[PDB]
Structure 1
Amino acid sequence: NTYQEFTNIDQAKAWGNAQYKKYGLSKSEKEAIVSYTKSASEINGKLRQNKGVINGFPSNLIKQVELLDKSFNKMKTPENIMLFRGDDPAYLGTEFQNTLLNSNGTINKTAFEKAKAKFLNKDRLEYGYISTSLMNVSQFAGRPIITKFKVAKGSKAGYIDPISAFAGQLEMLLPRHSTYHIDDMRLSSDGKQIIITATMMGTAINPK
């Protein structure tokens, strides 16, 4: 299976904007998505902490989460696509927070081997929503960990960039409680980054 990889910002925006125009999101769904782009770290943090159980959340956050979940009934990718993220060391676990990079700003080889043993050829379940970009955009592309997600035609995925509170992110949102498989992990040419290739399986949250 081949996955569409956008190579040009204008081409990516054109395609994304075309997708967004057809979603027919409701007023309430749009409000929930706007708020997500302002408060994603709080929302995803609480989802991770509680392993996806939202019963104890404030009433307004339950409503927001259920609206985001339901919005994916309208938001699917029309083709196999590649999506991107940049992550900081803690993404690999607490043990990598202050050990992944050496004093030169280069990936420590012992940490890289430990990360490979931990994640290579394994599944990973994410309790939060996954914010991605259509390309490796500048804002996040200098982070030490770059992930390329292979997302199959028909999968829940939404270009929310047109109503995001923030610019330059080419943001495609993926549903919460998604599982992906780490296929490949290697250092970059200059040794400053870990490039991860993963295959998106899909989400366990499927209302309606």
Structure 2
Amino acid sequence: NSKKTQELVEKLPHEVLELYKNVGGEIYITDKRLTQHEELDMFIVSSEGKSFPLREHFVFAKGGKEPSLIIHAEDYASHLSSVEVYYELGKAIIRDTFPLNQKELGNPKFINAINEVNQQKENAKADEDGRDLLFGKELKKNLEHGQLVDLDLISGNLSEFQHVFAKSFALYYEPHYKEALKSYAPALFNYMLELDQMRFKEISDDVKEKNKNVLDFKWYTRKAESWGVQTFKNWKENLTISEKDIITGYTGSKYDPINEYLRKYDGIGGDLDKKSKKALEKIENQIKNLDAALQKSKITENLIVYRRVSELQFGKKYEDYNLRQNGIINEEKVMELESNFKGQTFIQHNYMSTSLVQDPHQSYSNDRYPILLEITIPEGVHGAYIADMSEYPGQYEMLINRGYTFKYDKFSIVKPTREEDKGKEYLKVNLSI
């Protein structure tokens, strides 16, 4: 039954499912094999460390920009089956759901609990029950009993601690496993108890509160796209052919000359040859058209947009500055940037192309660019969602009008907490209009 399967998930607290729903997370129930689902060679590992081909298993959390939890409809009276579904849901929270997937495993509460489990005693003989219950094979071979876990060990072995979180989650919510968690790993039972009783709601309420002040899609494309297309549909339907053509052209070969023109003259009696004059006049007509287009479009809400950049963001004098070496962000160099640039401004003479989602493209994001600009655009700024008209699909472009001034507000170092960071830290710089 699909209901029997639905009922099973609906047992999980509302707050966990709201957190997933907020990032466009979706839950699918299916009578077909998982690999025949439209959302989806691969192998999975169950809560007890058994490997199965994906096509043979009955539950899978698909991660990434559009998270999905795919569940094969089974009876689910069996607790051995039910617990795997809560386990994958646990992974979808700790791995795929902001803010837990960036912040929770580095939390003191998680690290305190996990250490307390790695230190249980039966001079008392060492007790391995907690380890046996919750830690995977590769973790136990890399972490011995009584060995201290720190932020560093967690960051190098992320999927191993995601599993420990997910399995704690699963044993806690599955009623016939809860008592074994309590008995054999009390510190981690208590950790999950506090999340279930208040802290999931506390995290969820803080997310709803932030959503009241500012619209931020992060790296989640499902909700971003729908909002871009619908909120700028009317504007786009009122573009002329010329306006639409030059918007498209700006995402292609017409970009460099327009940007060079605007940067050169910041937004006499000699004459120019025929060809240089014709080319200059075409460019001017392009700018007239982009200007006219974007003047018709006002952003209706405070909105966050994103832009990946190199150290050349901060001028020619930051050429070979090497902010990042071997994926570690240089803490001393970031303090020099903060000192020189925080609360300072710059004028953006060209239009400002940004992304409605953080890092929509892997070749043009974290491994190539050590700086993310997180840019707050207040309501009333002129700009528009142009992704549909781009020559480079999949980029979720928000085109902001030229000639605004931007301020540097905050400089934060970000640890690799997602497989999609590729192991490399980065500097996040907040800017505002």
TM-score range, shorter chain: 0.7 to 0.9
Which residues of 2 match residues 7-18 of structure 1 at below 5 A?
A: 7=218, 8-18=220-230
Q: Partner amino acid for 1:175? A: N
Kept in 2, the 8 Å contact 1:137–1:170? The answer is no
- Cα deviation 1:13-68 (Å, max 9, x = unaligned): 1111113321111111011111111132442233112222xxx8700000001111
Structure with bigger strand share is: 1
1:95 is aligned to 2:349: no
Query: Which residue is equivalent to 2:412?
Result: 186
Q: Which amino acid aligns with 1:47?
A: L
- The percent of aligned pairs where both chains have the same amino acid is 26
5 Å-filtered alignment, 1:1-208, equals: 2-7=213-218, 8-23=220-235, 24-38=238-252, 39-52=254-267, 58-139=280-361, 140-142=364-366, 143-190=369-416, 192-200=425-433
TM-score normalised by length of structure 1: 0.86
The alpha carbon displacement at 1:148 in A equals: 1.0
Q: Which has the higher contact order (CA 8 A, sep 6+)?
A: 1
Aligned-pair distance for 1:161?
A: 0.7
The verdict on how the C-alpha distance between 1:42 and 1:113 changes in structure 2, with shifts beyond 3 A counting, is farther
How many angstroms apart in 2 are the aligned matches of 1:102 and 1:12?
30
Q: Which runs of 5+ in 2 are unaligned?
A: 1-211, 268-276, 417-423
2-side partners of 1:41 and 1:25: how far apart?
Answer: 23
Structure 2: how far apart are the matches of 1:196 and 1:103? 18
2-structure distance, mates of 1:46, 1:107: 35
Does the 8 A contact of 1:123 with 1:182 survive in 2? yes
Q: Deviations along 1:83-115, whole A, 9 cap, x unmatched?
A: 111011211112222113354243334432332
Provide structure 1 residue ranges, at least 5 long, that are not aligned to the other structure.
201-208
Larger CA Rg, structure 1 vs 2: 2
Take 1:159 and 1:44, find their aligned partners in 2: how far apart are those partners? 19
Please provide the CA RMSD for this pair: 2.0
Q: Which structure shows the higher helix fraction? A: 2
Cα distance in 2 between the residues matched to 1:106 and 1:42: 36
Are the structure 2 counterparts of residues 28 and 170 from structure 1 closer, same or farther at C-alpha, using a change threshold of 3 Å? same
User: In structure 2, do the counterparts of structure 1 residues 102 and 153 end up closer, same or farther at CA, with 3 Å as the change threshold?
Assistant: closer
Q: Which amino acid is 1:117 matched to? A: S
Structure 1 101/123 Cα, relative in aligned 2: closer, same or farther at 3 Å? Answer: closer
> In structure 2, do the counterparts of structure 1 residues 6 and 103 end up closer, same or farther at CA, with 3 Å as the change threshold?
closer
Distance 1:35 1:197 in 2: 29
Partner of 2:46: none
TM-score (norm 2): 0.43
Q: Secondary structure at the match of 2:328?
A: coil
Q: Check the 8 A contact 1:99/1:108 in 2, yes or no.
A: no
Distance 1:36 1:174 in 2: 12
Give the paired residue count: 197
**For the structure 1 residues 193 and 42, does the alpha-carbon distance in structure 2 shift closer, same or farther, using more than 3 Å as the test?**
farther
